[PDB]
């Protein structure tokens, strides 16, 4: 495992999802918005504490180089499971254990991704490795944990 141009591109896409005003930096406001779209309601202090742990130039916001350094790191995310479980619950709004096409579309829209019907259907198809037309938690985990 080494840093690749394809991974850098992928991380830039993820950075853009946070940097919704496209000014090149992630603020506390932007980080909190995304966290809310994914099932959490961080306090003001935790948002600034989170940014502080990677704000190398001390300007109080995260630029792409800082974000990249954080995403490329050899870590082993000890908080991974919790985050992925909360995210699953946001997708699975009716709590039936399966993410439907409507459910996926809803969350993607709130993340700023106005997916076409074809994209929604493709996303479900990619994840639905058991072929029952919907995405269960184990299937969701595979999509979330891919590197």
């Amino acid at each position: 495992d080494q840093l690749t141009e394809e991974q850098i591109a992928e991380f830039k896409e993820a950075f853009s999802l946070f940097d919704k005003d496209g000014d090149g930096t992630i603020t506390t406001k932007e980080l909190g918005t995304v966290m809310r779209s994914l099932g959490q309601n961080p306090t003001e202090a935790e948002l600034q504490d989170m940014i502080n742990e990677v704000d190398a130039d001390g300007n109080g916001t995260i630029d792409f180089p800082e974000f990249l350094t954080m995403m490329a790191r050899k870590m082993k995310d000890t908080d991974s499971e919790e985050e992925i479980r909360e995210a699953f619950r946001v997708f699975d709004k009716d709590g039936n254990g399966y993410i439907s096409a409507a459910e996926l579309r809803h969350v993607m829209t709130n993340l700023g991704e106005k997916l076409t019907d074809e994209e929604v259907d493709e996303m479900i198809r990619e994840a639905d490795i058991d072929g029952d037309g919907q995405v269960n938690y184990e299937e969701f985990v595979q999509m979330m944990t891919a590197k």
């Binding site: 992928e10 991380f11 896409e13 993820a14 999802l17 946070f18 980080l31 995304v34 966290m35 994914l38 959490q40 935790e46 989170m50 940014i51 742990e53 990677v54 974000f67 954080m70 995403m71 790191r73 870590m75 995310d77 000890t78 908080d79 991974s80 919790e82 985050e83 992925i84 995210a87 993607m108 993340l111 991704e113 997916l115 994209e119 996303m123 990619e126 994840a127 999509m143 979330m144 944990t145 891919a146």
Partner: peptide
């Protein structure tokens, strides 16, 4: 896997910022 990876990376970023 474009959109799933973006979503995954967003969750992973939040998890890593929270851990570090």
């Amino acid at each position: 896997r474009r959109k799933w990876q973006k979503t995954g990376n967003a969750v992973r970023a939040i998890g890593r910022l929270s851990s570090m």
